[PDB]
Symmetry: D2
Subunit: 254 residues, 4 copies
């Protein structure tokens, strides 16, 4: 049946930025769908909660310390995963950051800091995952967390560096899809709207200004992303590669 297309039994999934928000919910979802899940975060202490919730559904998570901006750590992450799980079938390149700062006042260091995690971290993770998948010869699926910020410019908060980085992620996704298609490795991006998670908690002062801009009238919940990440990680999405998928309560329409 159509339902069995969503089964992840026998699959090995890596999720970066897995300690909170979207990554956390997605890790739990994948375990619920039968996957062996490796969870990565800048500080492995932060992975306790997700690893416990994963145990809670009868799986065992593999926690991995990784700063996705650092090639040596990304290398160590994939080696830890292939070493302990035997390989990798699914990679969610999800670690991301934001700050608020007028473009005219923005130090280069701050511009670059957002590029390094948001674009370079995705590139390093996806490349490492893709290399492992090519070697296996079994195809695979890679998902990147972009943002509606890769399509539109958020207002009133000034986040030009964030917008730049997420447009980069959207198009890097397609570039990798084209190159990896001969290997039957699919690459797609998810572009969430405003989701009530830790990423946006510091921007609570803006929430009430964002809500009237969202046709569905509310910020999303991170649990509302699991169905889509499951879709992309599973056989249900076998014909989809190089796609971006907006999930934003209608925000990008007006």
């Amino acid at each position: 049946s159509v339902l069995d297309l969503f089964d992840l039994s026998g699959k090995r999934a890596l999720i970066t930025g897995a300690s909170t928000g979207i990554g956390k919910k997605v890790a739990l979802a994948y375990a619920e769908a039968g996957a062996q899940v490796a969870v990565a975060a800048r500080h492995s202490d932060a992975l306790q909660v997700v690893a416990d919730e994963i145990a809670g559904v009868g799986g065992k998570a593999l926690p991995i310390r990784c700063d996705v901006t650092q090639p040596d750590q990304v290398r160590g992450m994939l080696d830890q995963m292939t070493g302990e799980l035997g390989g990798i079938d699914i990679a969610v390149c999800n670690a991301g950051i934001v700050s608020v700062q007028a473009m005219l006042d923005m130090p280069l260091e701050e511009f670059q800091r957002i590029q390094d995690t948001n674009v370079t971290g995705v590139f390093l993770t996806a490349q490492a995952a893709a290399r492992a998948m090519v070697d296996q010869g079994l195809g695979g699926t890679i998902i990147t967390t972009a943002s509606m910020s890769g399509h539109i410019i958020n207002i009133p908060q000034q986040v030009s560096h964030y917008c730049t980085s997420k447009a980069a992620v959207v198009h890097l996704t397609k570039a990798m899809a084209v190159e990896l298609a001969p290997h039957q490795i699919r690459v797609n991006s998810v572009s969430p709207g405003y989701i009530r998670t830790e990423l946006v908690e510091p921007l609570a002062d803006y929430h009430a200004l964002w809500e009237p801009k969202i046709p569905l009238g509310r910020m999303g919940r991170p649990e509302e992303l699991t169905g889509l990440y499951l879709y992309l990680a599973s056989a249900a999405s076998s014909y989809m590669t190089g796609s971006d998928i907006v999930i934003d309560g209608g925000y990008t329409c007006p």
Copy 2:
């Protein structure tokens, strides 16, 4: 409560136009496998026997409805039948579409108009009728349109300028409806398939995954859009094309 439960359509009532063949037929069957009661519509009622039998085969009973989606009175009648027989509507898939090949330079107006009428106007009438019934129910709902990668790129070598025009129109109509229906919690989204084996040797080299897709490769996505799994998504277009639109 787990992610897989978000995809359950038990107790939901779905309408699919153009349900007799291809994508519509696979989606009808998938919705029945997921627990939905399914109304299947086509211009020729006898053509609906195959899908109705397949739905019987997974233990559903389909409601076959004859409808020309270009005709406002027949569309109204389709919704009346479905509301009357099933009690209402939670999901509509506005899928009926047509195509022909003709150089723009030589294209008669009748032919240009014929493709707009089914592909754009039929989607408009169907979504409108479904949205009206959903508004009256007060329970929200989900509407899905079948557009095409032809709404984003121009197919070659075949000349289908009218089809491409009609599919971009559907993509944007979908967004226009999503915006107006959001206050009613009725979500509206489009699917844009690439080449689906419902010329072949010329198309394949252009597709990064190296093959046309199978209509069964659309069922996961149409199920995603019809179910609670997609609760935060509205006004989105989703391309599913083997990578065709990337280069």
Copy 3:
């Protein structure tokens, strides 16, 4: 010099919807640039003002009655132009209409009325112009007036039928560009934002609601479109075909 790329001396231009707003300003601009201009409108009486302003710069306009929804009239328009001017080098498919109406309440007749002028009228005009250009063997340029409504959904006024029609125009433009490229006939669309013209005068109640949504802080003037239509009509745009060009004061960015 770069300036001579914009010269229309010796060129024959047809502009539909030429009695007011954008079409009127564009007709005057093309005459100022040296073109022989045929101006079309549903009622030829309405072309008096534009024909006079064209005389005002030392040209003579060819006024043509044409309902662009009617094949016989479109046929008559091109025949009148080729007959009197010898041919056609530039075609601006500009006639367009709008009404405001909730989608849920919209009669099919009203939906269709907007499609017929906005999409079908463009198709008929562009096809007729393109056929004449193919026969000439000299290449040519075709410009369509789309709208930012082909990219975004206007709020708060309900104009779903208008949005549908302009997305259609945007993509029809590209479809024609692909087919006409072997003939060296370029086809491009202009997608204006809110421009203070006759088209939007009935929607004056909305103006004050639109303005805060436009980053430049104001509606455009029809004179602010002439440079772009000149660009597309002239040799300055020799390498551009199948492009859409948004000119909207920043509206589509947020």
Copy 4:
């Protein structure tokens, strides 16, 4: 007052980075032909002699400025020189860009970063510095970035994933800046060229117009964006690609 007057750059002061060859060089010359005083910047000052001589040839005097656009202190110095010598800045073209060919799978991080640094970070620093000076002047202004059709599609067969990434970034950075600078009446727009003859036999069949473009075919558009002709346009990307992105 006529449409042609909208394109006059007399009395305007323009900065062009990457001005020593290709698009930047043609645009510099075109801006001088249109009456602008033109500062031309490149990483190697001797490379600017050709353009400076061509500008002399139409009766302009170019201001050559050595600048590595990746370096915030040199960018600041470039703007200081231009303000100091010309009195200010009305037009900035952030044009300097680079490319290499390398499979994503094998791409060293240094190489990925190298292309981002010039193509994205160099555009950011240049536009930022120009915008700061324009804000201080209080007279508005116009900023133009050179992106690429590589920001919309993925080139094949050559593997340039880093370049494609950098050009999508530039397209969106341009919009982000347009939004923030609109209150200052500083417009910001991007140009996305296709294949410009500044592999050939593989690319040509993919281009509907059947040829690569010439850099002189960009001058009209860069003049459009730099002059009063484009007064209502900001946050726009303009593709100029012989039709490449349509199929």
